[PDB]
Amino acid sequence: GSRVKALEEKVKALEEKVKALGGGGRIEELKKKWEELKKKIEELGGGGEVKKVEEEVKKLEEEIKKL
Structure with a gap:
């Protein structure tokens, strides 16, 4: 449960x-x-609030996808 790992990719x-x-x-x-x-x-570690990160990386994809 690294999250940041699967994120590093995004x-x-x-x-x-x-x-x-x-x-x-x-x-x-x-x-x-x-x-x-x-x-x-x-900082992804001391708290499973990744939900934020992701959602954050999303705002990009969405926009970027529109860009």
Whole structure:
């Protein structure tokens, strides 16, 4: 029950993609949360509140998918 592990994958994916995005006013936002999210996947341990992280990594996929 690492969670962050199965996350590292998404994040890593939210890195090349988010970065892949031509950017210039659209990724910043998601990139913002992505910054507060990845930081969450880090502390991911002292508390099974991953539900947050995930949901956070989702906001990306969704948007990114729309991006």
